[PDB]
Amino acid sequence: MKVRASVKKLCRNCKIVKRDGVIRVICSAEPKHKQRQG
């Protein structure tokens, strides 16, 4: 998954989630859009 400092939705299906202390991005269509360190 991509790590980055700025994370943001990519597809219309990307979703954004705050798990543990960390901000994330989950896409149900496109694995490339997973993101952490947000």
Partner RNA sequence: CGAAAGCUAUUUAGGUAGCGCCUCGUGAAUUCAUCUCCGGGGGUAGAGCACUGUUUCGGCAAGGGGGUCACUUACCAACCCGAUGCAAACUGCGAAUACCGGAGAAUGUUAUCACGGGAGACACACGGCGGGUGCUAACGUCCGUCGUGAAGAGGGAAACAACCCAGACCGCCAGCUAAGGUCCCAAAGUCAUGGUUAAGUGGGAAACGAUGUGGGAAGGCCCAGACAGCCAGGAUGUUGGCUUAGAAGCAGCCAUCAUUUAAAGAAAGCGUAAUAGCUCACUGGUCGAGUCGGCCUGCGCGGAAGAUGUAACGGGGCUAAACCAU
Partner RNA sequence: GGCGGUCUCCUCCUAAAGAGUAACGGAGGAGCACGAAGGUUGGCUAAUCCUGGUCGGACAUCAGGAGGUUAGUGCAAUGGCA
Partner RNA sequence: ACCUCGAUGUCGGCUCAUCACAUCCUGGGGCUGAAGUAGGUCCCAAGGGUAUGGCUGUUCGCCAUUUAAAGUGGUACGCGAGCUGGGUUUAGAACGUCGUGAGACAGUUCGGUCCCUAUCUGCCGUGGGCGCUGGAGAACUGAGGGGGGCUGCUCCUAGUACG
Out of 11, 16, 17, 22, point to the residue binding Zn ion (CB under 5 A). Answer: 11
What span, in angstroms and rounded, lies between the C-alpha atoms of 38 and 32? 16
- Using an 8 Å Cβ cutoff, are 18 and 36 in contact? no
State the minimum distance, in angstroms, from the CB of residue 14 to RNA. Answer: 10
Determine if 34 is a binding residue for RNA (CB under 7 A).
yes
**Secondary structure E strands in the chain:** 17-19, 22-24
Total residues at the site for Zn ion (CB under 5 A)? 6
Determine if 28 is a binding residue for RNA (CB under 7 A).
no
What span, in angstroms and rounded, lies between the C-alpha atoms of 14 and 33? 7
Query: Can you give the binding site for RNA, defined by CB under 7 A?
Result: 1-3, 5-9, 11-12, 16, 18, 21-23, 29, 31-32, 34, 37-38
